[PDB]
From a paper:
Some immune escape mutations, represented by F456L, even convergently appeared recently in multiple independent XBB derivative strains, such as EG.5, XBB.1.5.10, FE.1 and FD.1.1, indicating strong selection pressure due to herd immunity. To elucidate the disparities in binding affinity between XBB.1.5, XBB.1.5+F456L, and XBB.1.5+L455F+F456L (“FLip”) spike proteins with ACE2, we determined the structures of these three spike proteins individually in complex with hACE2 to interrogate the conformational change on their RBD-ACE2 binding interface. As we expected, all three spike trimers mainly showed two ‘RBD-open’ and one ‘RBD-closed’ conformations with one or two ACE2 bound. Consistent with DMS results, L455F significantly dampens hACE2-binding affinity of XBB.1.5 RBD, and F456L also slightly weakens the binding to hACE2. Compared to XBB.1.5, F456L mutation does not substantially affect the interactions on the RBD-ACE2 interface.
Author numbering:
A (entry chain A): 734 to 824, 846 to 1074
B (entry chain C): 294 to 615, 630 to 672, 687 to 733
C (entry chain C): 1027 to 1137
D (entry chain B): 978 to 1026
E (entry chain B): 734 to 782
F (entry chain A): 294 to 391
The structure:
């Protein structure tokens, strides 16, 4: 709220602000625009389906284990252990609250996001990929495995002879990924930087508020108490101009950051819709190597994707 | 009506809007002064006798005292009250940390020479001032009393000084003739030009040869201790109420609460990284009071279309309600977004058309109701290890997609 | 470029559901697209098996999957129901009758 | 500095300070605007590669 | 640089600059961010093998 | 310690960090002016074989030359001066038209 931010409870300062034309309306309109765009951004990256599916309780997918991805009812919040580690690893407010620099709560809470991701996991586990187009079609996991193998130029007889090895490698890798993520604490740098850049910009503006622009002092009230009114207009004007320049700089930087964030969210939406509900044949778009599938997981302000891939390991030379 | 004003139309559409903030008003004023009230020894440089000169500036270190309008203005015919800091219209209701009433008694021919821009005797390294010099200039007359017949030769001034003199520094010496190529050094005599200038003003002279005593002040602010100001009734404080507090020259607006931390014995002006006065000590007692401002808010109006109805429901952002929300209405809620009055509550699940925050959505039912989010229809598809599903009919569906390409060019 | 001049299998890029065609139209400041798509309507449930035993020989379909309405067994494609008689040209043989899991016993006709 | 006096010097230095500050702000904002587009083009180039 | 562009080698210009005080830190921070990002920008367009 | 001061924190992890400039101070000062300093007519009216009578004092205006203050303190009889306004010590730094 710019009017209270520039000047406190003194109507003379407000009357001086009316001399500068319609400018607060532009700032408030731009801030509402960035707020509503950031609220709209998540709905095209998460609400990709309109049916909350539920997995059956008995888990008998040919020896595969999915305990590290599906929700756990033991914790009251329906979050998988990967989501709980994500919440734990990623981490003066009254001062910014006291100067009209309030924050706003988002439209969707974390429980609804967890519900959406759980529904997406159930859909991509029990229904293949047909649920991205029409009605959900039930498919047992080995047959969907065989067809996904057939998708990358390996005939489906290969899977049915090495089923246990596939299950063991999958389960061992899924077990490894938790400790691999938790070992390096610097791997979550994107969301950390996203939070702290905005926090330090807000704190920089708040500290900038108390800095005299060559006037007698910084506080308007004591200067009003000392100086007599119709010569004080030449006194309290540098405060107004400097604070408006700071506000314009802040809103310009916020718009600049919002453009990049929305571009990244659009890329995330395309990646989710092209690597979860299908199987792409574009090299290095949904992982590394030949692509097999992907799984989504929620995180504070964003997503993390588990890309399941395939790599040939041992080889021999022949004459052709 | 406020929403109609802000939209600048005659029909609002739907959803969240914005207007001004809450800004709960204060109640009254509180003064906080030390109870000790002595009398200030002013006017000592004003009516006794010939007081001082430019050779001995009055370096009066005024201690704790209570000075006001009654002692000052003892003689009405003053001169121009040349303000530099605080205007002469108000000299009460503000307290200084110190004051130094400098004085000199020269004639009133050149009153403007005391200015930082207007120079003269001051330019040749006499009594000098800094660029700010926040005190005023009191150039009150001294005629017919210091106007001794045939000239007050005991009143005198320094013509020149050899080297640069810092402002507020005494140089009273022999002041020998150090200049010139001849090495007289004030002893040989020719062209000595001693700074000595005694006064030969008979009262028959003009008004430019009559003494006008000049006293000036000097002080500063933004400091916890104070020593001198006018009287006021320091009424007792109010506990946890939105009042206008004044503490010996520093004002404010907020609520005062009992302190929890401990101040150092000489510390009385605590603050934090918010760079504003968090707490302050009582002027009379040791009592420390924390200051926090009265609550703000964010006002928003919820309405359906004016084509349908003209009822509304109003939400105050970020304010606990249970609470400081003035009057009431039909129903009061306690959502996490803030307070909300106007709409009912119901556990039944529906889709969203008017978002609010934290998964709460309101709509027209024959009344404005509110509920929590509903993501969609629950479903669960049967599963086995050997069951499959295969379609048999197919439909052709066509959808649209709109994309902007070019926006209108402009030139200035 | 990738929605009209060709046909794309990138889901949710050229439309909703399986993509077939698209037609462009102009508009003041911009373009509009119509996306001719294709979606399956109604379905039936069946019992399936991954492979077929015959003389200790495991069989695998060249396309589609095996289905069984309870009476006998057929093989059909993935996105439409069209059963056909299991024949040696429709399938290929590799391995024997113990490596895979869930294989049933039946006969395959050879002309 | 040699012209006028230090009491009357700062009455003209302020305009110079404001003008140079405004020019620097314009240059930096233009730099940000160009850098965003060059990053978008580089990301497309990486995808093509 | 903050001071060498905004002023000369005169102390009163730096004294007049520090009234605003916390302005050029944002300038230097934005320029350093741009420099580091554009240094990074070649790594994901060439180092893919 | 300089990095600690400029980071506004008591710990720094790793990596490069920017700090102020080198800015070698200047050594000394040199002024430069042309050698030729033509003489103003103060000494031209000062030095003469004969001087004008006190009945009528002839007016002379001196302008547009280099002052050369050393010519005032050049003559032999130097026992009568009353200098007011601008002293000879502070003479040759101010500019006057005539």
């Amino acid at each position: 709220d710019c009017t209270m931010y520039i000047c406190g409870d003194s109507t003379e300062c407000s009357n001086l602000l009316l001399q500068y034309g319609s400018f607060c309306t532009q700032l408030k309109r731009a801030l509402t625009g960035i707020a509503v765009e950031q609220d709209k951004n998540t709905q095209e990256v998460f609400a990709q389906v309109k049916q909350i599916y539920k997995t059956p309780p008995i888990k008998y997918f040919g020896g595969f284990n999915f305990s590290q991805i599906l929700p756990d009812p033991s914790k009251p919040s329906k979050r998988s252990p990967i989501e709980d580690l994500l919440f734990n690893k990623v981490t003066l407010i009254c001062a910014q609250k006291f100067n009209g620099l309030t924050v706003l709560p988002p439209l969707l809470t974390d429980e609804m996001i967890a519900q959406y991701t759980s529904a997406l996991l159930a859909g991509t586990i029990t229904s293949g990929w047909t649920f991205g187009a029409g009605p959900a079609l039930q498919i047992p996991f080995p047959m969907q495995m065989a067809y996904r193998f057939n998708g990358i130029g390996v005939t489906q007889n290969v899977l049915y002879e090495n089923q246990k090895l596939i299950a063991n490698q999958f389960n061992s890798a899924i077990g490894k990924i938790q400790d691999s993520l938790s070992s390096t604490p610097s791997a979550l740098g994107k969301l950390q930087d996203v939070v702290n850049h905005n926090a330090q910009a807000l704190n920089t503006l708040v500290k900038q508020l108390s800095s005299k622009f060559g006037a007698i002092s910084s506080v308007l009230n004591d200067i009003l108490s000392r100086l007599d009114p119709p010569e004080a207009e030449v006194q309290i004007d540098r405060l107004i101009t400097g604070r408006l320049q700071s506000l314009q700089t802040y809103v310009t930087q916020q718009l600049i950051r919002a453009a990049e964030i929305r571009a990244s969210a659009n890329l995330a939406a395309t990646k989710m819709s092209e690597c979860v509900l299908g199987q792409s044949k574009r090299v290095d778009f949904c992982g590394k190597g030949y692509h097999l599938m992907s799984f989504p997981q929620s995180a504070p302000h964003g997503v993390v994707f588990l890309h399941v891939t395939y790599v040939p390991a041992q080889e021999k030379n022949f004459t052709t | 009506s406020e929403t109609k004003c802000t939209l600048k139309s005659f029909t609002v559409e739907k959803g969240i809007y914005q207007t001004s903030n809450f800004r709960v008003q204060p109640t009254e004023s509180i003064v906080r002064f030390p109870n000790i009230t002595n009398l200030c020894p002013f006017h000592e440089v004003f009516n006794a006798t010939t007081f001082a000169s430019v050779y001995a500036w009055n370096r009066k270190r005024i201690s704790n005292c209570v000075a006001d309008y009654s002692v000052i203005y003892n003689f009405a015919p003053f001169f121009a009250f040349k303000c530099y800091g605080v205007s002469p219209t108000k000299l009460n209701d503000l307290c200084f940390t110190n004051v130094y009433a400098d004085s000199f008694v020269i004639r009133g021919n050149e009153v403007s020479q005391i200015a930082p821009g207007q120079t003269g005797n001051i330019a040749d390294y006499n009594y000098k001032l800094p660029d700010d010099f926040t005190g005023c200039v009191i150039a009150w007359n001294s005629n017919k009393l210091d106007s001794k017949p045939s000239g007050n030769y005991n009143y005198l001034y320094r013509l020149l000084r050899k080297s640069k003199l810092k402002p507020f520094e005494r140089d009273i010496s022999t002041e020998i003739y150090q200049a010139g190529n001849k090495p007289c050094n004030g002893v040989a005599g020719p062209n000595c030009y001693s700074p000595l200038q005694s006064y030969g003003f008979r009262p028959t002279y003009g008004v430019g040869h009559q003494p006008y005593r000049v006293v000036v002040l000097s002080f500063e602010l933004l400091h916890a201790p104070a020593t001198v100001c006018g009287p006021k009734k320091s009424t007792n404080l109010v506990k946890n109420k939105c009042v206008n507090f004044n503490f010996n020259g520093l004002t404010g607006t907020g609520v005062l609460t009992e302190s929890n931390k401990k101040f150092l014995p000489f510390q009385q002006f605590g603050r934090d990284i918010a760079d504003t006065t968090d707490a302050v000590r009582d002027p009379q007692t040791l009592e420390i009071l924390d200051i926090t401002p009265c609550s703000f808010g964010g006002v928003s109006v919820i309405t359906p279309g004016t084509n349908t109805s003209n009822q509304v429901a109003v939400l105050y952002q970020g304010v606990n309600c249970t609470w400081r929300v003035y009057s009431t209405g039909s129903n009061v809620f306690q959502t996490r977004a803030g307070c909300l009055i106007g709409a009912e509550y119901v556990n039944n699940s529906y889709e969203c058309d008017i978002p609010i925050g934290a998964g709460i959505c309101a709509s027209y039912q024959q009344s404005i109701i509110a509920y929590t989010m509903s993501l969609g229809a629950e479903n669960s598809v049967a599963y086995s290890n050997n069951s499959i599903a295969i379609p048999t009919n197919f439909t052709i569906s066509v959808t649209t997609e709109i994309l902007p390409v070019s926006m209108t060019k402009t030139s200035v | 470029s990738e929605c009209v001049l060709g046909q794309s299998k990138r889901v949710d890029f050229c439309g909703k559901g399986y993509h077939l065609m698209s037609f462009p139209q102009s508009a003041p400041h911009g373009v509009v697209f119509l996306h001719v798509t294709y979606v399956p309507a109604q379905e039936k449930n069946f019992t399936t098996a991954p492979a077929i035993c015959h003389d200790g020989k495991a069989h695998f379909p060249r396309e589609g999957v095996f289905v069984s309405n309870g009476t006998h067994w057929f093989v059909t494609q993935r996105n439409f129901y069209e059963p056909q008689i299991i024949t040696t040209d429709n399938t290929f043989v590799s391995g024997n009758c113990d490596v895979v899991i869930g294989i049933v016993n039946n006969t395959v006709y050879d002309p």
